[PDB]
Amino acid sequence: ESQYQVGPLLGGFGSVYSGIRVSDNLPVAIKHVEKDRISDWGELPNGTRVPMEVVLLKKVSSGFSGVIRLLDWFERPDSFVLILERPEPVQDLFDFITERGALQEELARSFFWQVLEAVRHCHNCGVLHRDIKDENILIDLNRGELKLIDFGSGALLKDTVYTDFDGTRVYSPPEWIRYHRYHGRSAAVWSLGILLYDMVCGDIPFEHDEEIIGGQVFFRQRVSSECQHLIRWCLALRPSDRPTFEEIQNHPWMQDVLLPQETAEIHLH
Amino acid sequence: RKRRRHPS
Ligand SMILES: CN1CCC(CNC2=NC(=O)C(Cc3csc(-c4ccc(OC(F)(F)F)cc4)n3)=[SH]2)CC1
């Protein structure tokens, strides 16, 4: 209010404004969420009733990571306001892929590794993001670091079946499409396979339900056999046939990853 | 096929 200098609207991008924290000129994003539009609510450690998004953001925002950090939040009469970290300079991964086309595998490896580490961090914090996609990934173009955003479709991580989902349908697995259910981890691995294909091919593999359930991955771009193999494994139709995060990260295609700064110097600067 | 965003 007096704490923040409010700049322009960032980015059908909800209501997120550029901001500067007054105390120390920190770049922030100021995200407004209408109470009437929130379906999932939770309670904080002290029983303050808040949107689930706030609960999940607090759980992941302790320490450094590839997750955007919630710095503060406020309740207003008809909304919640969320103060989030803002890297600068930044571009989201969707626009990056649109402008550059299919990524070199070296770059895709670095990015994909970082998303994997970020999603492991969420899972270690008891959080399932449920909307892993290029649009929800920011690239810090100077540091070469990726940041996961928008926990508005997320849930507490659990080992039992999920029967609700409001993420992005084209990144959702066939068990969701066909049966209206999924397990968190295996569904996340499906969406990571869609993302990896998107990176190395320049667009997602499936647009329609029939393609999602079909179990057929055609490569439009030149992609190494090892990368093709990892993608097809992540997109196994049967959830139990998909790799664990450990198996992904030990896959031959994932060896010799660049550091974020190396990535920035080679591909972004 | 146009590359497009997809809402949640
Ligand atoms: C597809 N979704 C729709 C809802 C959107 C808004 N919902 C969101 N939920 C979040 O937690 C957010 C956090 C956050 C922190 S910094 C930042 C940012 C900075 C610059 C941008 O502009 C660019 F890239 F051009 F520089 C765009 C975004 N966003 S944004 C996010 C994307």
Side-chain angles (χ1 to χ4, degrees), chain A residues 115-146:
Chain A
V115 176
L116 288 163
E117 292 283 315
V119 175
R120 289 180 64 194
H121 173 76
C122 294
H123 291 198
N124 297 334
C125 298
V127 173
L128 190 68
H129 184 280
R130 300 206 293 189
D131 204 15
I132 298 159
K133 60 179 176 169
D134 57 3
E135 307 186 60
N136 288 333
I137 295 169
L138 299 178
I139 309 160
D140 181 323
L141 298 165
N142 283 348
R143 301 178 64 80
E145 290 171 14
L146 267 53

PDB file of all heavy atoms in Angstrom, chain A residues 115-146:
ATOM      1  N   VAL A 115      13.798 -27.500 -14.072  1.00  0.00           N
ATOM      2  CA  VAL A 115      12.378 -27.728 -13.795  1.00  0.00           C
ATOM      3  C   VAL A 115      12.242 -28.972 -12.923  1.00  0.00           C
ATOM      4  O   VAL A 115      11.499 -28.972 -11.942  1.00  0.00           O
ATOM      5  CB  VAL A 115      11.535 -27.839 -15.093  1.00  0.00           C
ATOM      6  CG1 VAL A 115      10.078 -28.170 -14.777  1.00  0.00           C
ATOM      7  CG2 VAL A 115      11.600 -26.538 -15.880  1.00  0.00           C
ATOM      8  N   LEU A 116      12.986 -30.018 -13.255  1.00  0.00           N
ATOM      9  CA  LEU A 116      12.986 -31.215 -12.418  1.00  0.00           C
ATOM     10  C   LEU A 116      13.379 -30.920 -10.973  1.00  0.00           C
ATOM     11  O   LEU A 116      12.697 -31.368 -10.060  1.00  0.00           O
ATOM     12  CB  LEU A 116      13.908 -32.298 -12.969  1.00  0.00           C
ATOM     13  CG  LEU A 116      13.428 -33.009 -14.230  1.00  0.00           C
ATOM     14  CD1 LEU A 116      14.623 -33.727 -14.847  1.00  0.00           C
ATOM     15  CD2 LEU A 116      12.328 -34.012 -13.920  1.00  0.00           C
ATOM     16  N   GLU A 117      14.468 -30.189 -10.774  1.00  0.00           N
ATOM     17  CA  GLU A 117      14.874 -29.823  -9.424  1.00  0.00           C
ATOM     18  C   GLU A 117      13.776 -29.003  -8.705  1.00  0.00           C
ATOM     19  O   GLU A 117      13.504 -29.246  -7.529  1.00  0.00           O
ATOM     20  CB  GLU A 117      16.235 -29.122  -9.418  1.00  0.00           C
ATOM     21  CG  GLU A 117      17.397 -30.048  -9.811  1.00  0.00           C
ATOM     22  CD  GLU A 117      17.839 -30.999  -8.694  1.00  0.00           C
ATOM     23  OE1 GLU A 117      17.971 -30.557  -7.538  1.00  0.00           O
ATOM     24  OE2 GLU A 117      18.047 -32.203  -8.962  1.00  0.00           O
ATOM     25  N   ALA A 118      13.136 -28.078  -9.418  1.00  0.00           N
ATOM     26  CA  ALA A 118      12.069 -27.250  -8.853  1.00  0.00           C
ATOM     27  C   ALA A 118      10.840 -28.065  -8.418  1.00  0.00           C
ATOM     28  O   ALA A 118      10.261 -27.824  -7.361  1.00  0.00           O
ATOM     29  CB  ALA A 118      11.646 -26.186  -9.846  1.00  0.00           C
ATOM     30  N   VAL A 119      10.469 -29.035  -9.240  1.00  0.00           N
ATOM     31  CA  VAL A 119       9.330 -29.884  -8.950  1.00  0.00           C
ATOM     32  C   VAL A 119       9.651 -30.853  -7.795  1.00  0.00           C
ATOM     33  O   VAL A 119       8.779 -31.114  -6.963  1.00  0.00           O
ATOM     34  CB  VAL A 119       8.836 -30.637 -10.208  1.00  0.00           C
ATOM     35  CG1 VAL A 119       7.721 -31.617  -9.854  1.00  0.00           C
ATOM     36  CG2 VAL A 119       8.324 -29.662 -11.259  1.00  0.00           C
ATOM     37  N   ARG A 120      10.886 -31.365  -7.728  1.00  0.00           N
ATOM     38  CA  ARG A 120      11.315 -32.133  -6.561  1.00  0.00           C
ATOM     39  C   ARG A 120      11.195 -31.304  -5.285  1.00  0.00           C
ATOM     40  O   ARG A 120      10.783 -31.822  -4.242  1.00  0.00           O
ATOM     41  CB  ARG A 120      12.757 -32.625  -6.694  1.00  0.00           C
ATOM     42  CG  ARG A 120      12.958 -33.732  -7.707  1.00  0.00           C
ATOM     43  CD  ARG A 120      14.431 -34.141  -7.766  1.00  0.00           C
ATOM     44  NE  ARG A 120      14.894 -34.704  -6.496  1.00  0.00           N
ATOM     45  CZ  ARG A 120      16.166 -34.903  -6.160  1.00  0.00           C
ATOM     46  NH1 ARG A 120      17.171 -34.589  -6.993  1.00  0.00           N
ATOM     47  NH2 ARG A 120      16.448 -35.411  -4.964  1.00  0.00           N
ATOM     48  N   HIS A 121      11.591 -30.033  -5.367  1.00  0.00           N
ATOM     49  CA  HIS A 121      11.484 -29.124  -4.235  1.00  0.00           C
ATOM     50  C   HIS A 121      10.029 -28.990  -3.803  1.00  0.00           C
ATOM     51  O   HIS A 121       9.737 -29.121  -2.631  1.00  0.00           O
ATOM     52  CB  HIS A 121      12.101 -27.751  -4.551  1.00  0.00           C
ATOM     53  CG  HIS A 121      11.865 -26.730  -3.495  1.00  0.00           C
ATOM     54  ND1 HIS A 121      12.557 -26.716  -2.303  1.00  0.00           N
ATOM     55  CD2 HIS A 121      10.973 -25.713  -3.433  1.00  0.00           C
ATOM     56  CE1 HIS A 121      12.107 -25.719  -1.557  1.00  0.00           C
ATOM     57  NE2 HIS A 121      11.157 -25.086  -2.230  1.00  0.00           N
ATOM     58  N   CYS A 122       9.117 -28.781  -4.748  1.00  0.00           N
ATOM     59  CA  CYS A 122       7.692 -28.735  -4.403  1.00  0.00           C
ATOM     60  C   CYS A 122       7.272 -30.006  -3.672  1.00  0.00           C
ATOM     61  O   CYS A 122       6.626 -29.914  -2.644  1.00  0.00           O
ATOM     62  CB  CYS A 122       6.798 -28.548  -5.625  1.00  0.00           C
ATOM     63  SG  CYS A 122       7.018 -26.936  -6.433  1.00  0.00           S
ATOM     64  N   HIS A 123       7.644 -31.170  -4.219  1.00  0.00           N
ATOM     65  CA  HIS A 123       7.227 -32.452  -3.657  1.00  0.00           C
ATOM     66  C   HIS A 123       7.813 -32.667  -2.257  1.00  0.00           C
ATOM     67  O   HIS A 123       7.107 -33.110  -1.356  1.00  0.00           O
ATOM     68  CB  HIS A 123       7.577 -33.605  -4.597  1.00  0.00           C
ATOM     69  CG  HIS A 123       6.764 -33.612  -5.854  1.00  0.00           C
ATOM     70  ND1 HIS A 123       6.643 -34.721  -6.652  1.00  0.00           N
ATOM     71  CD2 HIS A 123       6.020 -32.645  -6.445  1.00  0.00           C
ATOM     72  CE1 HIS A 123       5.889 -34.432  -7.700  1.00  0.00           C
ATOM     73  NE2 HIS A 123       5.483 -33.183  -7.587  1.00  0.00           N
ATOM     74  N   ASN A 124       9.066 -32.257  -2.067  1.00  0.00           N
ATOM     75  CA  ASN A 124       9.710 -32.305  -0.750  1.00  0.00           C
ATOM     76  C   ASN A 124       8.999 -31.403   0.238  1.00  0.00           C
ATOM     77  O   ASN A 124       8.979 -31.722   1.400  1.00  0.00           O
ATOM     78  CB  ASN A 124      11.172 -31.870  -0.804  1.00  0.00           C
ATOM     79  CG  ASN A 124      12.041 -32.777  -1.660  1.00  0.00           C
ATOM     80  OD1 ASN A 124      11.761 -33.950  -1.842  1.00  0.00           O
ATOM     81  ND2 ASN A 124      13.119 -32.214  -2.196  1.00  0.00           N
ATOM     82  N   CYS A 125       8.421 -30.288  -0.221  1.00  0.00           N
ATOM     83  CA  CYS A 125       7.627 -29.409   0.632  1.00  0.00           C
ATOM     84  C   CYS A 125       6.142 -29.794   0.801  1.00  0.00           C
ATOM     85  O   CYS A 125       5.393 -29.058   1.455  1.00  0.00           O
ATOM     86  CB  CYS A 125       7.714 -27.969   0.114  1.00  0.00           C
ATOM     87  SG  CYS A 125       9.389 -27.297   0.155  1.00  0.00           S
ATOM     88  N   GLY A 126       5.721 -30.932   0.238  1.00  0.00           N
ATOM     89  CA  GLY A 126       4.339 -31.427   0.373  1.00  0.00           C
ATOM     90  C   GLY A 126       3.376 -30.775  -0.618  1.00  0.00           C
ATOM     91  O   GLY A 126       2.167 -30.755  -0.379  1.00  0.00           O
ATOM     92  N   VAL A 127       3.907 -30.256  -1.727  1.00  0.00           N
ATOM     93  CA  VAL A 127       3.135 -29.494  -2.703  1.00  0.00           C
ATOM     94  C   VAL A 127       3.182 -30.119  -4.098  1.00  0.00           C
ATOM     95  O   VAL A 127       4.254 -30.440  -4.618  1.00  0.00           O
ATOM     96  CB  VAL A 127       3.634 -28.039  -2.779  1.00  0.00           C
ATOM     97  CG1 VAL A 127       2.953 -27.270  -3.902  1.00  0.00           C
ATOM     98  CG2 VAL A 127       3.413 -27.350  -1.451  1.00  0.00           C
ATOM     99  N   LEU A 128       2.002 -30.270  -4.694  1.00  0.00           N
ATOM    100  CA  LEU A 128       1.838 -30.682  -6.083  1.00  0.00           C
ATOM    101  C   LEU A 128       1.358 -29.466  -6.897  1.00  0.00           C
ATOM    102  O   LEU A 128       0.289 -28.898  -6.625  1.00  0.00           O
ATOM    103  CB  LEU A 128       0.810 -31.827  -6.152  1.00  0.00           C
ATOM    104  CG  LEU A 128       0.686 -32.556  -7.493  1.00  0.00           C
ATOM    105  CD1 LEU A 128       1.942 -33.371  -7.806  1.00  0.00           C
ATOM    106  CD2 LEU A 128      -0.546 -33.449  -7.496  1.00  0.00           C
ATOM    107  N   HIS A 129       2.154 -29.051  -7.873  1.00  0.00           N
ATOM    108  CA  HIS A 129       1.850 -27.839  -8.647  1.00  0.00           C
ATOM    109  C   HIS A 129       0.633 -27.998  -9.564  1.00  0.00           C
ATOM    110  O   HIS A 129      -0.187 -27.076  -9.670  1.00  0.00           O
ATOM    111  CB  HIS A 129       3.104 -27.406  -9.445  1.00  0.00           C
ATOM    112  CG  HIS A 129       2.952 -26.118 -10.203  1.00  0.00           C
ATOM    113  ND1 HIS A 129       2.304 -26.035 -11.419  1.00  0.00           N
ATOM    114  CD2 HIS A 129       3.399 -24.867  -9.931  1.00  0.00           C
ATOM    115  CE1 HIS A 129       2.358 -24.791 -11.858  1.00  0.00           C
ATOM    116  NE2 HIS A 129       3.004 -24.059 -10.970  1.00  0.00           N
ATOM    117  N   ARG A 130       0.563 -29.142 -10.248  1.00  0.00           N
ATOM    118  CA  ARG A 130      -0.532 -29.523 -11.157  1.00  0.00           C
ATOM    119  C   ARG A 130      -0.741 -28.708 -12.440  1.00  0.00           C
ATOM    120  O   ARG A 130      -1.709 -28.941 -13.184  1.00  0.00           O
ATOM    121  CB  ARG A 130      -1.846 -29.617 -10.404  1.00  0.00           C
ATOM    122  CG  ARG A 130      -1.801 -30.640  -9.299  1.00  0.00           C
ATOM    123  CD  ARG A 130      -3.176 -31.173  -9.012  1.00  0.00           C
ATOM    124  NE  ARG A 130      -4.030 -30.139  -8.454  1.00  0.00           N
ATOM    125  CZ  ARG A 130      -5.232 -30.356  -7.946  1.00  0.00           C
ATOM    126  NH1 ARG A 130      -5.740 -31.579  -7.906  1.00  0.00           N
ATOM    127  NH2 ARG A 130      -5.917 -29.336  -7.440  1.00  0.00           N
ATOM    128  N   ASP A 131       0.169 -27.792 -12.739  1.00  0.00           N
ATOM    129  CA  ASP A 131       0.078 -27.014 -13.968  1.00  0.00           C
ATOM    130  C   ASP A 131       1.474 -26.718 -14.535  1.00  0.00           C
ATOM    131  O   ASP A 131       1.782 -25.588 -14.928  1.00  0.00           O
ATOM    132  CB  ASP A 131      -0.741 -25.737 -13.733  1.00  0.00           C
ATOM    133  CG  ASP A 131      -1.363 -25.177 -15.029  1.00  0.00           C
ATOM    134  OD1 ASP A 131      -1.420 -25.902 -16.061  1.00  0.00           O
ATOM    135  OD2 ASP A 131      -1.806 -24.005 -15.006  1.00  0.00           O
ATOM    136  N   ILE A 132       2.307 -27.754 -14.581  1.00  0.00           N
ATOM    137  CA  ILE A 132       3.641 -27.632 -15.133  1.00  0.00           C
ATOM    138  C   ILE A 132       3.479 -27.454 -16.659  1.00  0.00           C
ATOM    139  O   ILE A 132       2.923 -28.313 -17.341  1.00  0.00           O
ATOM    140  CB  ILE A 132       4.507 -28.877 -14.840  1.00  0.00           C
ATOM    141  CG1 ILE A 132       4.690 -29.073 -13.322  1.00  0.00           C
ATOM    142  CG2 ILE A 132       5.873 -28.753 -15.517  1.00  0.00           C
ATOM    143  CD1 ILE A 132       5.068 -30.489 -12.943  1.00  0.00           C
ATOM    144  N   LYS A 133       3.911 -26.308 -17.155  1.00  0.00           N
ATOM    145  CA  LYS A 133       3.869 -25.985 -18.587  1.00  0.00           C
ATOM    146  C   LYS A 133       4.791 -24.797 -18.845  1.00  0.00           C
ATOM    147  O   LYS A 133       5.141 -24.081 -17.905  1.00  0.00           O
ATOM    148  CB  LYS A 133       2.436 -25.670 -19.057  1.00  0.00           C
ATOM    149  CG  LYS A 133       1.759 -24.486 -18.370  1.00  0.00           C
ATOM    150  CD  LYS A 133       0.376 -24.298 -18.969  1.00  0.00           C
ATOM    151  CE  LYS A 133      -0.421 -23.197 -18.292  1.00  0.00           C
ATOM    152  NZ  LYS A 133      -1.645 -22.879 -19.075  1.00  0.00           N
ATOM    153  N   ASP A 134       5.177 -24.598 -20.103  1.00  0.00           N
ATOM    154  CA  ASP A 134       6.132 -23.521 -20.462  1.00  0.00           C
ATOM    155  C   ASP A 134       5.651 -22.107 -20.052  1.00  0.00           C
ATOM    156  O   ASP A 134       6.445 -21.269 -19.644  1.00  0.00           O
ATOM    157  CB  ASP A 134       6.547 -23.588 -21.954  1.00  0.00           C
ATOM    158  CG  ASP A 134       5.370 -23.515 -22.936  1.00  0.00           C
ATOM    159  OD1 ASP A 134       4.202 -23.351 -22.535  1.00  0.00           O
ATOM    160  OD2 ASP A 134       5.640 -23.627 -24.152  1.00  0.00           O
ATOM    161  N   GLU A 135       4.344 -21.900 -20.082  1.00  0.00           N
ATOM    162  CA  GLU A 135       3.737 -20.652 -19.653  1.00  0.00           C
ATOM    163  C   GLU A 135       3.913 -20.343 -18.165  1.00  0.00           C
ATOM    164  O   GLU A 135       3.760 -19.209 -17.770  1.00  0.00           O
ATOM    165  CB  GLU A 135       2.226 -20.664 -19.902  1.00  0.00           C
ATOM    166  CG  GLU A 135       1.742 -21.001 -21.297  1.00  0.00           C
ATOM    167  CD  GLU A 135       0.244 -20.816 -21.403  1.00  0.00           C
ATOM    168  OE1 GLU A 135      -0.195 -19.679 -21.168  1.00  0.00           O
ATOM    169  OE2 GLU A 135      -0.488 -21.785 -21.699  1.00  0.00           O
ATOM    170  N   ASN A 136       4.144 -21.361 -17.349  1.00  0.00           N
ATOM    171  CA  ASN A 136       4.323 -21.203 -15.903  1.00  0.00           C
ATOM    172  C   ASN A 136       5.785 -21.307 -15.490  1.00  0.00           C
ATOM    173  O   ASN A 136       6.080 -21.607 -14.334  1.00  0.00           O
ATOM    174  CB  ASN A 136       3.445 -22.218 -15.153  1.00  0.00           C
ATOM    175  CG  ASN A 136       1.963 -21.861 -15.222  1.00  0.00           C
ATOM    176  OD1 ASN A 136       1.624 -20.687 -15.363  1.00  0.00           O
ATOM    177  ND2 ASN A 136       1.080 -22.853 -15.112  1.00  0.00           N
ATOM    178  N   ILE A 137       6.697 -21.026 -16.428  1.00  0.00           N
ATOM    179  CA  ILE A 137       8.123 -21.035 -16.142  1.00  0.00           C
ATOM    180  C   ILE A 137       8.696 -19.713 -16.616  1.00  0.00           C
ATOM    181  O   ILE A 137       8.541 -19.351 -17.796  1.00  0.00           O
ATOM    182  CB  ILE A 137       8.827 -22.228 -16.837  1.00  0.00           C
ATOM    183  CG1 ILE A 137       8.293 -23.539 -16.246  1.00  0.00           C
ATOM    184  CG2 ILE A 137      10.354 -22.112 -16.712  1.00  0.00           C
ATOM    185  CD1 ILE A 137       8.692 -24.768 -17.015  1.00  0.00           C
ATOM    186  N   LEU A 138       9.339 -18.995 -15.690  1.00  0.00           N
ATOM    187  CA  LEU A 138      10.084 -17.789 -16.014  1.00  0.00           C
ATOM    188  C   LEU A 138      11.569 -18.110 -16.138  1.00  0.00           C
ATOM    189  O   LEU A 138      12.106 -18.908 -15.362  1.00  0.00           O
ATOM    190  CB  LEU A 138       9.886 -16.714 -14.934  1.00  0.00           C
ATOM    191  CG  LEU A 138       8.460 -16.226 -14.700  1.00  0.00           C
ATOM    192  CD1 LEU A 138       8.399 -15.192 -13.570  1.00  0.00           C
ATOM    193  CD2 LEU A 138       7.871 -15.640 -15.980  1.00  0.00           C
ATOM    194  N   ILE A 139      12.208 -17.477 -17.114  1.00  0.00           N
ATOM    195  CA  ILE A 139      13.652 -17.512 -17.288  1.00  0.00           C
ATOM    196  C   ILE A 139      14.264 -16.171 -16.833  1.00  0.00           C
ATOM    197  O   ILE A 139      13.935 -15.137 -17.391  1.00  0.00           O
ATOM    198  CB  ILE A 139      14.024 -17.743 -18.761  1.00  0.00           C
ATOM    199  CG1 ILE A 139      13.286 -18.964 -19.342  1.00  0.00           C
ATOM    200  CG2 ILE A 139      15.534 -17.913 -18.913  1.00  0.00           C
ATOM    201  CD1 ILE A 139      13.223 -18.949 -20.858  1.00  0.00           C
ATOM    202  N   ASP A 140      15.135 -16.210 -15.818  1.00  0.00           N
ATOM    203  CA  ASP A 140      16.020 -15.096 -15.486  1.00  0.00           C
ATOM    204  C   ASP A 140      17.128 -15.148 -16.528  1.00  0.00           C
ATOM    205  O   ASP A 140      18.006 -16.010 -16.476  1.00  0.00           O
ATOM    206  CB  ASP A 140      16.592 -15.221 -14.073  1.00  0.00           C
ATOM    207  CG  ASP A 140      17.500 -14.055 -13.688  1.00  0.00           C
ATOM    208  OD1 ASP A 140      18.260 -13.524 -14.535  1.00  0.00           O
ATOM    209  OD2 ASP A 140      17.463 -13.661 -12.517  1.00  0.00           O
ATOM    210  N   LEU A 141      17.060 -14.217 -17.468  1.00  0.00           N
ATOM    211  CA  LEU A 141      17.908 -14.215 -18.643  1.00  0.00           C
ATOM    212  C   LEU A 141      19.380 -13.885 -18.347  1.00  0.00           C
ATOM    213  O   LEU A 141      20.252 -14.277 -19.124  1.00  0.00           O
ATOM    214  CB  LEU A 141      17.341 -13.233 -19.684  1.00  0.00           C
ATOM    215  CG  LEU A 141      15.928 -13.538 -20.223  1.00  0.00           C
ATOM    216  CD1 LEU A 141      15.340 -12.337 -20.947  1.00  0.00           C
ATOM    217  CD2 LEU A 141      15.941 -14.753 -21.135  1.00  0.00           C
ATOM    218  N   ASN A 142      19.659 -13.178 -17.249  1.00  0.00           N
ATOM    219  CA  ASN A 142      21.051 -12.869 -16.856  1.00  0.00           C
ATOM    220  C   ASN A 142      21.708 -14.008 -16.074  1.00  0.00           C
ATOM    221  O   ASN A 142      22.885 -14.308 -16.276  1.00  0.00           O
ATOM    222  CB  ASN A 142      21.123 -11.579 -16.024  1.00  0.00           C
ATOM    223  CG  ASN A 142      21.003 -10.319 -16.869  1.00  0.00           C
ATOM    224  OD1 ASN A 142      21.075 -10.341 -18.101  1.00  0.00           O
ATOM    225  ND2 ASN A 142      20.838  -9.199 -16.195  1.00  0.00           N
ATOM    226  N   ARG A 143      20.941 -14.626 -15.183  1.00  0.00           N
ATOM    227  CA  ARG A 143      21.447 -15.701 -14.333  1.00  0.00           C
ATOM    228  C   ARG A 143      21.282 -17.104 -14.946  1.00  0.00           C
ATOM    229  O   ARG A 143      21.977 -18.040 -14.535  1.00  0.00           O
ATOM    230  CB  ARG A 143      20.789 -15.629 -12.951  1.00  0.00           C
ATOM    231  CG  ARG A 143      21.025 -14.312 -12.217  1.00  0.00           C
ATOM    232  CD  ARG A 143      20.305 -14.281 -10.880  1.00  0.00           C
ATOM    233  NE  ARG A 143      20.851 -15.307  -9.996  1.00  0.00           N
ATOM    234  CZ  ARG A 143      21.981 -15.180  -9.289  1.00  0.00           C
ATOM    235  NH1 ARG A 143      22.688 -14.042  -9.303  1.00  0.00           N
ATOM    236  NH2 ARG A 143      22.406 -16.206  -8.545  1.00  0.00           N
ATOM    237  N   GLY A 144      20.395 -17.251 -15.936  1.00  0.00           N
ATOM    238  CA  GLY A 144      20.128 -18.561 -16.550  1.00  0.00           C
ATOM    239  C   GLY A 144      19.337 -19.526 -15.665  1.00  0.00           C
ATOM    240  O   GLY A 144      19.410 -20.745 -15.854  1.00  0.00           O
ATOM    241  N   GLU A 145      18.561 -18.961 -14.741  1.00  0.00           N
ATOM    242  CA  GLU A 145      17.816 -19.689 -13.750  1.00  0.00           C
ATOM    243  C   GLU A 145      16.338 -19.664 -14.087  1.00  0.00           C
ATOM    244  O   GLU A 145      15.789 -18.619 -14.427  1.00  0.00           O
ATOM    245  CB  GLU A 145      18.021 -19.079 -12.369  1.00  0.00           C
ATOM    246  CG  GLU A 145      19.417 -19.308 -11.815  1.00  0.00           C
ATOM    247  CD  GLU A 145      19.680 -18.525 -10.547  1.00  0.00           C
ATOM    248  OE1 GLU A 145      18.731 -18.006  -9.939  1.00  0.00           O
ATOM    249  OE2 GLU A 145      20.850 -18.423 -10.148  1.00  0.00           O
ATOM    250  N   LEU A 146      15.706 -20.824 -13.978  1.00  0.00           N
ATOM    251  CA  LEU A 146      14.283 -20.971 -14.241  1.00  0.00           C
ATOM    252  C   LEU A 146      13.523 -20.931 -12.922  1.00  0.00           C
ATOM    253  O   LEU A 146      14.019 -21.426 -11.885  1.00  0.00           O
ATOM    254  CB  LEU A 146      14.012 -22.254 -14.997  1.00  0.00           C
ATOM    255  CG  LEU A 146      13.972 -22.158 -16.519  1.00  0.00           C
ATOM    256  CD1 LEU A 146      15.206 -21.510 -17.081  1.00  0.00           C
ATOM    257  CD2 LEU A 146      13.785 -23.548 -17.107  1.00  0.00           C
TER     258      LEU A 146
END
